[PDB]
Design a protein around this nucleic acid. Sequence first.
DNA 1: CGGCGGTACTG
DNA 2: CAGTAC
DNA 3: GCCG
Length: 333
Amino acid sequence: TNHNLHITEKLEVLAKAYSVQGDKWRALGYAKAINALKSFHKPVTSYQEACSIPGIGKRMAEKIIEILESGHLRKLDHISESVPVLELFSNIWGAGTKTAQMWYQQGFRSLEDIRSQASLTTQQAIGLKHYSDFLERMPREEATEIEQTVQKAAQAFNSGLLCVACGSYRRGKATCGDVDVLITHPDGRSHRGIFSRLLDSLRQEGFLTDDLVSQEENGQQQKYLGVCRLPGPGRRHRRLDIIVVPYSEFACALLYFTGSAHFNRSMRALAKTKGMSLSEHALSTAVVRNTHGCKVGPGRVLPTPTEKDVFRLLGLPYREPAERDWLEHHHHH
DNA sequence: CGGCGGTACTG
DNA sequence: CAGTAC
DNA sequence: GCCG
Ligand SMILES: Nc1nc(=O)n([C@@H]2CS[C@H](COP(=O)(O)OP(=O)(O)OP(=O)(O)O)O2)cc1F
Ligand SMILES: [Ca+2]
Ligand SMILES: [Ca+2]
Ligand SMILES: [Ca+2]
Ligand SMILES: [Ca+2]
Ligand SMILES: [Ca+2]
Ligand SMILES: [Ca+2]
Ligand SMILES: [Ca+2]
């Protein structure tokens, strides 16, 4: 299936390195190049053939060929030494490249330097203490019980609540980095005020152990990012994301929350090429205009009762969640 | 060359 | 606003 | 990094 496996691995390493150093557009370019190589019907055999692939240009071709001809890749040996520390610190939830760079510049190089001397935000403290647990992907079966726990707690308040696990789970993966639960109610109204009760119920049984992003001052709270742990001996703490949306938003919210991230970006960039805007709330025939410039013209939602509607309105055929790794990847079936 | 998804918290 | 996240 |  992947005919250029030897080449992708090396480019990933390189990609990773730009990512932790904060060079994101460059990291973006690599990611796309890499998926394109993985998609290709055959080993790449010439520079020309490589350049012909969308997402692969001159610099990437040079490296691709260099690998194929000479077998390894020079540049992997000039990767700055800070990189693995930087990846280490960016693996703390709530710490990104800026924080990892600050930490590096004040001399920390291990998790101990962080624990014992770093200034940590509230979120980082939690990410640090669950560092290992949050690094481990969970099996699909743990995700199912996490989701059921949320669904039962919800359906105890209102049995008409719809709860669905999205993310990699809904794309059919075997393991999940974190569970993503989307809650709605078909009557258009009774999704309102749910979070207060749902979080309280989930806390009482001891299932939620820490909160990361949860603005509970707001009765119209839309999201919860926190930490759960299933009951029973030896269970790990897992990342849990819950969104509560109005039914009219369901299709767009389902699409967003199913992902993948690259898939959603490409869908969104497509919508904009066609004078629309795609968000987790809606698809909108929205457009700019600002007296010698551009701006906000919030341009009215197109109703999309299902995900198929969103695909149709963008000129695309429905894509099964399992085939939503990348938009530009066409699986046959 | 400039743009690269669109949005929600936290501090 | 900057940082980080989804 | 690549693309229009
Ligand atoms: N940057 C992102 N934009 C997105 O639109 N998403 C969307 C919203 S949540 C949905 C799933 O993303 P996750 O980050 O939980 O990633 P995942 O479920 O695909 O994979 P994993 O098993 O959780 O590692 O994708 C995620 C992003 F990280
Ligand atoms: Ca190309
Ligand atoms: Ca991080
Ligand atoms: Ca369910
Ligand atoms: Ca996930
Ligand atoms: Ca998630
Ligand atoms: Ca809070
Ligand atoms: Ca440039």
